[PDB]
């Protein structure tokens, strides 16, 4: 009985993920991906048909056509409105499987698919702590460090893989306390992140998604740093101490002057606000350095931004600078002229704290 172009029903395709022949498995996975692409119904179906644990399982298959295949299917299944598809991948240990494959990925294409999938999964709160717990060290050591071009002991590459990965990490650090603690205390991670951003800015790129993701990530990690950093009792600064060194601060300020991307503008302001928030030595120093002419205007200037979220970031920043301002003049000068409902309260709480 000679071969043909029969198209199988979804249940069959799923059944074939388990067939003896590897070529059947891989082509099934491939096809599965195609069927899901831009198709929410099919994706949700694959879940209800119990295909997800089967795909997750193939991530362990020795042959690349099969694992790459499964992984590309999972990628599509992990994207879209049906947040239960993401949960499903998590619930059958997708993340440790993905990580396990990552450790042995050798090529960009597979790495591309894995990290993108992780990025997709990371958009979902129920999965963030999972990724933090199982993917942090591999994402850091296998992806960020090697490809960043950074070196503890002094070129950037694989921009796409990096973006996916910085996006994933941005995502899992958006809210959780010990997600921030884990990430920022992860040797090399902050170092490399900053290195990435310099690299981009040295290419006159202050808008790339890769820059955006790294900065939102840095923003999160800066949140409450004066407090959550080991021995918050306050030679070359390493790791999370880089979050509050002049080096990065100047990067934020240059992005405010150079970046035309709301996300980046907002996160750079947010970073500054975070660093300034603390009543601690480095807060005193950063805050003082920031109350200088060129910086104050760069910040204040985005109070005239079209985008609400960036307007709000600047306000928070400015209000933080005013707390121990020792030249009400400079700050008052640059803020006031320019200074939703929550936005209003912020701009108001800020005017107040400026004039004490």
């Amino acid at each position: 009985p000679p071969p043909n172009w029969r198209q199988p029903e979804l249940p069959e395709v799923i059944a074939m993920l388990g067939f003896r022949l590897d070529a059947v498995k891989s082509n099934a996975a491939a096809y599965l991906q195609h069927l899901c692409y831009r198709n929410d119904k099919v994706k949700t179906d694959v879940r209800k048909l119990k295909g997800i644990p089967v795909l997750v399982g193939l991530l362990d298959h020795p042959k690349k056509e099969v694992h790459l295949g499964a992984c590309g299917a999972l990628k599509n299944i992990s994207f879209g409105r049906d947040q239960d598809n993401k949960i499903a991948i998590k619930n059958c240990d997708g993340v440790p499987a993905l990580v396990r494959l990552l450790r042995k990925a050798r090529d960009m294409d597979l790495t591309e698919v894995i990290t993108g999938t992780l990025w997709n999964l990371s958009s979902h709160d129920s999965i963030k702590m999972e990724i933090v717990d199982h993917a942090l060290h591999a994402l850091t050591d296998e992806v960020i460090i090697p490809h960043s071009g950074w070196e503890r002991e002094p070129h950037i590459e694989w921009e796409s893989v990096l973006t996916n990965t910085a996006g994933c990490l941005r995502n899992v650090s958006s809210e959780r306390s010990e997600a921030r603690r884990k990430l920022r205390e992860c040797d090399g991670l902050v170092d490399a992140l900053i290195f990435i951003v310099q690299a981009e800015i040295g290419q006159k790129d202050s808008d790339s998604k890769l820059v955006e993701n790294c900065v939102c990530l840095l923003r999160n990690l800066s949140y409450q740093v004066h407090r959550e950093i080991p021995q918050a009792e306050r030679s070359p600064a390493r790791g999370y101490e880089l979050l509050f060194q002049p080096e990065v601060v100047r990067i934020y300020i240059s992005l405010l002057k150079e970046s035309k991307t709301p996300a980046i503008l907002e996160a750079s302001a947010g970073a500054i606000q975070n660093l300034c928030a603390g009543r601690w030595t480095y807060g005193r120093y950063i805050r003082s350095a920031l109350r200088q002419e060129k910086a104050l205007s760069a910040i204040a200037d985005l109070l005239t931004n079209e985008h609400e979220r960036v307007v709000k970031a600047a306000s928070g920043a400015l209000r933080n600078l005013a707390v121990d301002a020792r030249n009400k003049e400079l700050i008052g000068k640059h803020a006031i002229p320019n200074l939703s409902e929550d936005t209003v309260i912020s701009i108001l709480n800020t005017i107040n704290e400026v004039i004490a």
């Binding site: 198209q7 692409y37 992990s78 879209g80 999938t117």
Partner: peptide, 18 residues
Amino acid sequence: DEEGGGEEDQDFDLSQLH
């Protein structure tokens, strides 16, 4: 948050399904 991974179409050999 943002599902930056997105999705892609994919190629396959239908004639091997079976």
